[PDB]
Amino acid sequence: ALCCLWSDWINEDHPSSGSDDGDRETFDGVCGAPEDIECRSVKDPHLSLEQLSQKVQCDVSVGFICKNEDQFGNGPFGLCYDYKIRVNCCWPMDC
Ligand SMILES: [Ca+2]
Ligand SMILES: [Ca+2]
Ligand code: NA
Numbered sequence: 758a759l760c761c762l763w764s765d766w767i768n769e770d771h772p773s774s775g776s777d778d779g780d781r782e783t784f785d786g787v788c789g790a791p792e793d794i795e796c797r798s799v800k801d802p803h804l805s806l807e808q809l810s811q812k813v814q815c816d817v818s819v820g821f822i823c824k825n826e827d828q829f830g831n832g833p834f835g836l837c838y839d840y841k842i843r844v845n846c847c848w849p850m851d852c
Pocket of ligand 1: 770771772775776777780781
């Protein structure tokens, strides 16, 4: 069968850190090919993305991407929340 486990939280980028003007989280070095991914805001971790307001990308191919300019605001106001991810990874095991 397949034995699947959820990783610890990954939170290596932040909306006002680095040079990417956003928040990107990857599972490189954690799992080779996640079966699932969970992307959550740090300040409201119980809300799924379908319960959040921001424009983000969250999938098992690229991981998590939020770009600050995609968020609601006028002028320079408005940016990504800080997000964190878990990945669900499965191993072929007889668990
Ligand atoms: Ca950043
Ligand atoms: Ca982050
Ligand atoms: Na975005």
